Amino acid sequence: QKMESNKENREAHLAAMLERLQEKDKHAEEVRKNKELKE
Amino acid sequence: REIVHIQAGQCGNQIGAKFWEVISDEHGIDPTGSYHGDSDLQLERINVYYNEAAGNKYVPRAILVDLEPGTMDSVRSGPFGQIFRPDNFVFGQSGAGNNWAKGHYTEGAELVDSVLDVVRKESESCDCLQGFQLTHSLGGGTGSGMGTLLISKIREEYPDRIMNTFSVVPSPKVSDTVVEPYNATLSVHQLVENTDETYCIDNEALYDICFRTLKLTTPTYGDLNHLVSATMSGVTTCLRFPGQLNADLRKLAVNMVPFPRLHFFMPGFAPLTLTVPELTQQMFDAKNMMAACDPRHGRYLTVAAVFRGRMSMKEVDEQMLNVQNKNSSYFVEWIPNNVKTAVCDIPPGLKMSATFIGNSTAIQELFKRISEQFTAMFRRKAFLHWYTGEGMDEMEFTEAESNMNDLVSEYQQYQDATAD
Amino acid sequence: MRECISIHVGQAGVQIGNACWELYCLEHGIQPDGQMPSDKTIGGGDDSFNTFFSETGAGKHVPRAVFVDLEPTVIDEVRTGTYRQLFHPEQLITGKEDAANNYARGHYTIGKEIIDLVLDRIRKLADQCTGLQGFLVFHSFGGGTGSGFTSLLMERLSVDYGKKSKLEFSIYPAPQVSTAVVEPYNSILTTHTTLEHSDCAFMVDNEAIYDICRRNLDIERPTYTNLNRLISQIVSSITASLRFDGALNVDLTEFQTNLVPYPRIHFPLATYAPVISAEKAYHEQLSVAEITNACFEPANQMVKCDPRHGKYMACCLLYRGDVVPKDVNAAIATIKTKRSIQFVDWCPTGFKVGINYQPPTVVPGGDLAKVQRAVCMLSNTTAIAEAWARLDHKFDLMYAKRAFVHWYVGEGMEEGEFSEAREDMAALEKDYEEVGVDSV
């Protein structure tokens, strides 16, 4: 039970870190697109 | 084991090159990468920073990055310039013109993929990568904007590794480029979320040390970087030489970072160019800090002290206990035993030296000073069109300011906190 | 028959194991190559030293020992050092990345990757035993591997060996030689998870050993080498009853019957004498009465606490060298009339005595004088709970602000494990108060 609970929790900590980093790459696409449609 | 070093932009590459010159001399590595030293202690942990090549050559695990070729041509011509791996030079032609948005979103995004190709090549041949250290300034466009983009991309591919920065904070006393506070605030917003440990190297403090203490009427970048290279040698001693304490990046982070966002360290050095009592008093003196913060204006969460040279370990222990006992008000009572001491036998042209790493709530003085200069410009939207021109919205400046003001509040919260 | 397997975990466990095995080789006349000329039975036997040493057909005496660390640099010094030929390579187990002073990394993230291999190597030692008695586990409380990997291993050994005895030698943290701010977290987490899996634990306070080295051996600034030589003498006194024969010799298991009144109350206080420099020992012979008297001086204890302010539940004296029962009994009678020795009302007051005739040995280049007689006192005193109270207080200061807790949560741990571990320590502190109250 402890090693399963631990594996789950660690994987959820990392998945959320990657979700935050993927939203930055999403926001960066939006900024480079905003520059294009300004010109 | 292995650390991968990245140096980004003009400042990053200038302080980066001095770092490699200084630690190559300490490890007995010459400019052709040959070992000509006199001690086994020099080679025991050489693999932390150097790769071994054909013919017992040592090659820095170093990647050199800029959007402008000029500074990297001068590195290649610098004394240790031939020691770097030629394929580890990654440069564009455009430049960033001190514009964070060009470094982070437009010019830098074009170059970042070829930097990651080199990072991946260095990372893949590591027995067991500890993580990364980046040297950069926060006041320009490449080191600031592209530096923080690289951190975000490296973290996406190596999320379980430690990310460490040597981050040079801007001052009106050294550059008269007026958008530096914008670039520094936008950079701090990235560093708060995406680094584990940041050494705050304040150009304000380096200028004041060169002027007031070392009596240099007209400090150059050369004079500033002499202080930076001595500090950087000091704070990496425990990573590079056999030893007990903070001997790898994760162990340092676990000793120094009680809350994930409060990872901005005030480095110190003594003597500024000596008995153990004098080293100890000087390394804790406001005048010896590489961040323009008075430690008596806050409290220490955590401290690492590193003594270098042949000296009495008994005298070092007694003096380190003396400073804590006599200054007990400036160490939070709810982190017991929060000051750790290392002694390394190899000194840096000195018989003895002390390097100080502090996680002090007084670091809020550095962020408040940047925040004041940011607001003075941002309230009149001065020069914003250079940033909106690259696709950024005003709201991203508002968010960066709020997050840096939140960081200040958080240092203040732990400063006021009490055990009872 | 009656084999004991030693398991040395992490830097402290490994460096203390190096000092213990060096000393056992010198005590039994075993050379660094494993040869023992005095042993006439080649390739096996059931002599008392065979509890700790197996024998190859080539006459090599091999420690019944596994060394485990999650990084290689400490065990690499055993692999290339003076005693490199003593150990088969498969007894020396290393990973690539350590637990970074984090219990959660030692128990879960890094530890899970090597635990099946370690149990494999331990099984290989167990399979060569005709009557395995149990395990001796050496570790720090403070390190990530010493704390978290040891907890994992002790849990897995309870599963694979059921109720086989597990004894610990546990290094309790001191600020003079500590390497991590989070040692109190690691200490409480491992004490909580290990407590149901351990039969008997000897705590060694680095601060008590540090002070004994400074005060009694005149070492200005003790190193691990200084501390470990002294610790090895105390460990050797405790295991001497398993490794030597003699008429007056009393097996450690028989002392354990007296030392553990309730399963949780299993932390004996060790006190060792004499600890004396060669310069002070010269023409000063310490008698049975002097070394016995020195066992009731708090300054000679392995854990800092004051037994004069608690109650005894047991007192055992393990003598080695030139000691006869007459001199012991006169020493004890004198001490009873003079010292603050108060037993709980439910325990008999008799001191239990063992004598092993083989005198103490010292390691060349050591700080300790070679003496004709020595003693280790093992007492079960309520005063040992002071050591828990000190660690619990440091835990509470940091945990009230959740200082450093994100390093544990990042590795998959929950806050609930912290509060559960701390509650178990509160209940332990309370158990030590209760056993000291008089019967109604």
Ligand SMILES: CNCCC(=O)N(C)[C@@H](C)C(=O)O[C@H]1CC(=O)N(C)c2cc(cc(OC)c2Cl)C/C(C)=C/C=C/[C@@H](OC)[C@@]2(O)C[C@H](OC(=O)N2)[C@@H](C)[C@@H]2O[C@@]12C
């Ligand atoms: C007037 N001695 C020249 C000063 C100089 O060369 N500097 C410091 C330049 C490079 C500079 O950074 O100008 C900044 C402003 C500044 O610090 N000062 C001293 C300045 C500089 C100028 C006029 C000024 O008004 C009197 C002032 Cl106050 C002169 C101007 C507009 C230079 C613009 C250069 C752009 O390159 C094509 C830039 O580098 C600017 C860049 O965007 C970019 O993408 N690239 C944006 C973000 C920079 O915000 C700015 C504007």
Ligand SMILES: Nc1nc2c(ncn2[C@@H]2O[C@H](COP(=O)(O)OP(=O)(O)OP(=O)(O)O)[C@@H](O)[C@H]2O)c(=O)[nH]1
């Ligand atoms: N007596 C003694 N204490 C030691 C020794 N080595 C380390 N310690 C203590 O043990 C604690 C640190 O744990 P270590 O054993 O170094 O750590 P580890 O088990 O290797 O764990 P990680 O390095 O975090 O993977 C501190 O309290 C140290 O003072 C040693 O040789 N002797």
Ligand SMILES: Nc1nc2c(ncn2[C@@H]2O[C@H](COP(=O)(O)OP(=O)(O)O)[C@@H](O)[C@H]2O)c(=O)[nH]1
């Ligand atoms: N201490 C120090 N600061 C520098 C150096 N070079 C540039 N800076 C500072 O860096 C900031 C500008 O960033 P720079 O590295 O020049 O821009 P980039 O090349 O776009 O990253 C300013 O605050 C400068 O004062 C240097 O060699 N040493």
Ligand SMILES: [Ca+2]
């Ligand atoms: Ca035999």
Ligand SMILES: [Mg+2]
């Ligand atoms: Mg520049």
Ligand SMILES: [Mg+2]
């Ligand atoms: Mg270790």
